Design a protein around this ligand. Structure first.
Ligand code: SF4
Ligand code: SF4
Ligand code: FES
Lengths: 169, 46, 107, 672, 90, 83
């Protein structure tokens, strides 16, 4: 449909003008998916308004994905889906991040993001500032190296096995 | 197996039946000095 | 250097080397697509055989790993961020060549 | 250079040059078959059709040169309908053989069928199919899968130079198979297995054994020749499957030899696995690695100073030679003995350049005359023979044999006998000396075979004089050692020296065991039981070239390295590492231990080897080398016969090649 | 800058060291009570050459979580005995 | 006669090399005629500082670094070369 592509286009322009201290570009994937960019420092302020009405009542994170790419000056590339209800439609803001720079946590803005901060922390190196409690999930205890680092072998570097002489795995 | 022979020339071997055997292939018989073994079936022809 | 951050055992940031290169065209192919774009293959280690069934049982943690890139400098810098030993190799684009259907008919 | 528009953007393209080459320059890739650079253009297989910006009908992309601001819509719909149009025709008869055809993993015809060809079939009749044409020990012709991109004939007539095979008949029934049963053997016969577009021609020895998506594809270089061509070895997990050429402008350029292509097969058969001491009975017997190495480690201390005499094979091994070198200097005296009876007085070694092939082989096409003396180029170095033939078509430049009856593919002047025609032209007695005078950038090539022949030094002196004259008028296991001065290299130092140390006696062990009654003991650090092992006490298992990282030097002086592939077969280790163990046992532990520390030792003892692709040097200048050799000069003789002559003689050289099943099948093939 | 982070790590050593006997007690570990301490000191020597600014504080972030786990009885005898690599062939 | 070998390294383009480059086109043949004996390897190695190396039966090695020295100075250390 052309129509949706129109409305998303114009709306992308709309937000592009409303708050352009940080919207690097508002590309519309041709199959009707808008997606603006964000300077990594700018995460909270954008998303904040993204809940706040103008039309951007995009409540509820659908997810907090963390695409990786070995190239680029900063490899990890965070992504935020969002959904507005009354105007039933979805957008997708996203940023970028150094292996070492601590981007802030976005838990307060989208509310249901507490679990995700922990996820991406234990599936990646990236740290979220002002997060109440990053800690491991989806792993063993020690384990150490983050998976999903695009490098890092799927077979990992370790294995458990039970050993009778010490009577322990 | 006995070697099948036909007075014609080119023949098609499907390995027995339609869509239950190997892909249809035509075995040439340009040289009478040798049998025409099928690629998949393994059945000689002349 | 981020060696402490990665959980990787010291052995494999040490006693082995990456081997950056842009892959050669499979020569059976006439295609060119897969040729381009740097990748970051590691060196091979030992791989024996399963006493049973004859499988190629293998010890090394990370033999199969491989990574694409857009630019070589980015690749070298990449491994440097990892503190990796490396063997950078030149892109080896074929020289352009003259061609002429009529030169076949000089005399 | 003309401006031309690839679909949209302007491109300042080179004058003339085919539309295909234009889009190649923008990088967009036209579908192709019959065309191939490093071969020749042809109008068959019109899968390359592309649409002119304005002219209504499409033209073959590799045909028309670009000109005058042309625009060309590769993606234009009419082009696409054209391509589907052709592809349906190609697939109208190619037999349903994908699962069994050995080309199945990457046949270009498949991928072209995917990217462009319409998916529904709409042929609905009967494919033609044709009988096989047996051709030799190697290639497995199947035909029927043939699509008459003549290609292979354009390979044969224009590179192998043989024109035995060719097209036959008209319309359908026309066949690229050669008429008459006669077998087609040639030294470049192997490369067609690469060149063949589909599965119509694929290597018998490798056949069925594996599938393309499976095998890992290591990059390295050949060792069967010191020519040093780049390759892609391919292994199905822990075991080598098949070799293919890897293109490189300075050497192989997409081609490869043939003895090398099937050389790997010998690795699988007889090979060193465990150390083997002589027993009291004189039988070879399997042993622990440790007791053996400690045994000889103590054994060679008594003879510190001279006595002990290491002997390299013809294949080995840069890191092994530095390691063994310190083995020989930490011990007080030593035997740097190669194998080829290469003359050393007057020292071509110290100046480096005399044993170098001065012009790049890449520079060979620039030379306007070639002076081949003593040994035929094709058997000694096929890629070079391909190079000179390549220019032979590209240029009308002269060449000359000095001298043999050998059958090189192309027209060339034949001379007479060594001191005769050589010293005569050197003194300008030969008319040939004149044409050598007027010639631009003259090239004189002297084979390694000539360097022995009883009085090798005399032959070298004669050829050097010719080099001096031109200037006045104006207008393995070999080059590596001489990069590090292991001359004499010849075993002529003797003076019988007890406890010889083979790196590989499979080659020079055929000679004589004269030191053995004086000292039967011979450490043997080979990787086959061939020749050297049976007549040698204490056997050391050792790695083949696929495993070792060790560099080898191009005859040009390029010194590029092989990479690891499949690890040593058994208890065997990489060769040098045994020595770095040995010195450590002796108490004269060497400064290096890692491969890279000892690459730092190349970074001292040379340090020009640590420049893997860098042939260039300051050069000693030919006149200065001439003066350096001027003080010797000695009596000569007429005869000069190259070792190989026949191809069957070419099939067997180093012990690995005789361990080959398929090479044995070839030597049986040509002889029967 | 460095040093400001080094104090952090010393604090961390205090915490670990003092906690260790409780670890051996509560977990019924039969490691020599000293050995855990020594091994702690060693693990502290493992990165005793790191010199980057932010990387070290990040190191104490990853250092907190472990004492965080042993204090909460998260991980177990297996998981905490894991550090000693005791089953490995020399 | 302790020395077994001698070697020399020379980049083709550093200026500090030419005072040694000049040493080779002319002094060299004089040297070999003066030195039938032990090997005198020359290299075109592009090490920025040209060098000198000397083997013993001991395996110990002379290691003479040089910078932009006159060829006569090269000759000087070369005559300092002895048994
Ligand atoms: S190789 Fe010949 S047969 Fe095998 S798939 Fe490609 S085209 Fe079909
Ligand atoms: S031989 Fe190779 S190239 Fe010549 S037609 Fe048959 S397949 Fe095409
Ligand atoms: S290559 Fe253009 S016609 Fe086949």
């Amino acid at each position: 449909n052309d129509v949706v592509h129109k409305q998303l286009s114009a709306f992308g322009q709309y937000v592009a003008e409303i708050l352009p201290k940080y919207v690097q570009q508002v590309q519309v994937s041709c199959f009707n998916e808008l997606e603006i960019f964000i300077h990594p420092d700018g995460v909270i302020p954008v998303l904040t308004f993204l809940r706040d009405h103008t039309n951007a009542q995009f409540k509820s994170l659908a997810d907090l994905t963390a695409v990786d790419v070995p190239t680029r000056q900063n490899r990890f590339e965070i992504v935020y889906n969002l959904l507005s209800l009354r105007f039933n439609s979805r957008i997708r803001v996203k940023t970028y991040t150094d292996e070492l720079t601590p981007i802030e946590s976005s838990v307060t803005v989208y509310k249901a993001a507490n679990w995700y901060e922990r996820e991406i922390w234990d599936m990646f190196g990236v740290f979220f500032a002002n997060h109440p409690d990053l800690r491991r999930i989806l792993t063993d205890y020690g384990f150490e190296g983050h998976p999903f680092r695009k490098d890092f072998p799927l077979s990992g570097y370790v294995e458990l096995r039970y050993d009778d002489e010490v009577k322990r795995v | 197996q006995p070697v099948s022979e036909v007075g014609s020339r080119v023949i098609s071997c499907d390995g027995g039946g339609g869509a239950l055997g190997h892909p249809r292939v035509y075995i040439n018989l340009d040289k009478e000095t040798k049998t025409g073994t099928c690629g998949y079936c393994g059945l000689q022809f002349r | 250097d981020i060696t402490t951050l990665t959980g990787v055992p010291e052995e494999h940031i040490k006693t082995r080397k990456v081997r950056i290169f842009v892959p050669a065209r499979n020569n059976m192919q006439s295609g060119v697509n897969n040729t381009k774009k740097w990748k970051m293959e590691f060196d091979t280690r030992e791989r024996w055989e399963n006493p049973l069934m004859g499988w190629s049982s293998t010890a090394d943690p990370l033999s199969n790993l491989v990574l694409t890139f857009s630019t070589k400098e980015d690749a070298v810098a990449f491994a440097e961020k990892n503190g990796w030993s490396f063997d950078v190799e030149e892109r080896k684009v074929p020289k352009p060549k003259s061609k002429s259907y009529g030169a076949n008919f000089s005399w | 250079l003309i401006e031309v528009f690839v679909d949209g953007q302007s491109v300042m393209v080179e004058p003339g040059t085919t539309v295909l080459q234009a889009c190649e320059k923008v990088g967009m890739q036209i579908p192709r078959f019959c065309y191939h650079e490093r071969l020749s253009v042809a109008g068959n297989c019109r899968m390359c059709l592309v649409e002119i910006e304005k002219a209504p009908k499409v033209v073959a992309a590799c045909a028309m040169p670009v000109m005058k601001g042309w625009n060309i819509l590769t993606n234009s719909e009419k082009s696409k309908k054209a391509r589907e149009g052709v592809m349906e025709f190609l697939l109208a008869n190619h037999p349903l053989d994908c699962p069994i055809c050995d080309q199945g993993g990457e046949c270009d015809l498949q991928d072209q069928s995917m990217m462009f060809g319409s998916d529904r079939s709409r042929f609905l009749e009967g494919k033609r199919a044709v009988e096989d044409k047996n051709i030799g020990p190697l290639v497995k012709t199947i035909m029927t899968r043939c699509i008459q991109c003549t290609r292979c004939i354009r390979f044969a007539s224009e590179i192998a130079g043989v024109d035995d095979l060719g097209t036959t008949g008209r319309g359908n029934d026309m066949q690229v198979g050669t008429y008459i049963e006669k077998m087609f053997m040639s030294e470049l016969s192997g490369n067609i297995i690469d060149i063949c577009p589909v599965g119509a021609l694929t290597s018998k020895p490798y056949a069925f054994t594996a599938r393309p998506w499976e095998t890992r594809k290591t990059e390295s270089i050949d060792v069967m020749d010191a020519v040093g061509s780049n390759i892609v070895v391919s292994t199905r997990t822990g075991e080598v499957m098949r070799i293919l050429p890897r293109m490189h402008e300075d050497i192989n350029e997409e081609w490869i030899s043939d003895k090398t292509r099937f050389a790997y097969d010998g690795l699988k058969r007889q090979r060193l696995t465990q150390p083997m001491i002589r027993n009291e009975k004189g039988l070879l017997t399997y042993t622990t690695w440790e007791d053996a190495l400690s045994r000889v480690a103590g054994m060679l201390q008594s003879f510190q100073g001279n006595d002990v005499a290491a002997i390299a094979g013809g294949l080995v091994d840069a890191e092994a030679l530095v390691a063994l070198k310190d083995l020989l200097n930490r011990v007080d005296s030593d035997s740097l003995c190669t194998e080829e009876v290469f003359p050393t007085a007057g020292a071509g070694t110290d100046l480096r350049s005399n044993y170098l092939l001065n012009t790049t082989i890449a520079g060979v096409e620039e030379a306007d005359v070639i002076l081949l003396v003593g040994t035929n180029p094709r058997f000694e170095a096929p890629l070079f023979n391909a190079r000179i033939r390549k220019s032979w078509l590209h240029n009308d430049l002269k060449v000359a044999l000095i001298g043999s009856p050998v059958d090189l593919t192309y027209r060339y002047d034949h001379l007479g006998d060594s001191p005769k025609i050589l010293q005569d032209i050197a003194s300008g007695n030969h008319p040939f000396s004149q044409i050598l005078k007027e010639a631009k950038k003259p090239m004189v090539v002297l084979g390694s075979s000539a360097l022995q022949r009883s009085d090798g030094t005399a032959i070298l002196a004669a050829v050097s004089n010719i080099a001096q004259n031109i200037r006045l008028s104006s207008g393995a296991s070999q080059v590596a050692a001489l990069d590090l001065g292991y001359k004499p290299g010849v075993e002529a130092i003797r003076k019988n020296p007890p406890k010889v140390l083979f790196l590989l006696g499979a080659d020079g062990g055929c000679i004589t065991r004269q030191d053995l009654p004086k000292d039967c003991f011979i450490i043997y650090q080979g990787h086959h039981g061939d020749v050297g092992a049976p007549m040698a006490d204490v056997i050391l298992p050792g790695a083949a070239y696929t495993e070792k990282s060790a560099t080898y030097v191009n005859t040009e002086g390029r010194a590029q390295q092989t990479k690891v592939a499949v690890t040593p077969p058994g208890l065997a280790r990489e060769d040098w590492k045994i020595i770095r163990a040995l010195s450590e046992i002796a108490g004269m532990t060497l400064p290096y231990d890692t491969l890279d520390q000892v690459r730092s030792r190349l970074e001292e003892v040379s340090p020009n080897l640590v420049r893997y692709d860098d042939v260039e040097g300051a050069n000693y200048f030919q006149q200065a080398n001439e003066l350096s050799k001027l003080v010797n000069q000695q009596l000569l003789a007429d005869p000069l016969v190259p070792p190989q002559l026949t191809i069957k003689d070419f099939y067997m050289t180093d012990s690995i090649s005789r361990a080959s099943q398929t090479m044995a099948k070839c030597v049986k093939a040509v002889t029967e | 800058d460095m040093n400001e982070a080094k104090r952090r790590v010393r604090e961390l050593y205090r915490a670990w060291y003092r906690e260790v006997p409780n670890t051996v007690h509560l977990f019924q570990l039969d490691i020599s009570v000293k050995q855990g301490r020594d091994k702690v000191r060693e693990m502290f020597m493992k990165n005793a050459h790191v010199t980057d600014p932010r990387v070290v504080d990040l190191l104490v972030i990853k250092g907190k979580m472990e004492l965080e786990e042993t204090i909460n009885v998260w991980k177990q005898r297996t998981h905490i005995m894991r550090f000693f690599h005791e089953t490995e062939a020399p | 006669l302790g020395l077994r070998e001698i070697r020399i390294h020379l980049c083709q383009r550093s200026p500090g090399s030419q005072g040694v480059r000049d040493f080779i086109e002319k002094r060299y043949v004089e040297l070999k005629k003066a030195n039938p004996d032990l090997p005198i390897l020359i290299r075109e190695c592009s090490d920025v500082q040209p060098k000198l190396w000397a083997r013993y039966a001991f395996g110990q090695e002379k290691n003479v670094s040089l910078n932009n020295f006159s060829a006569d100075q090269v000759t000087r250390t070369l005559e300092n070369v002895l048994s």
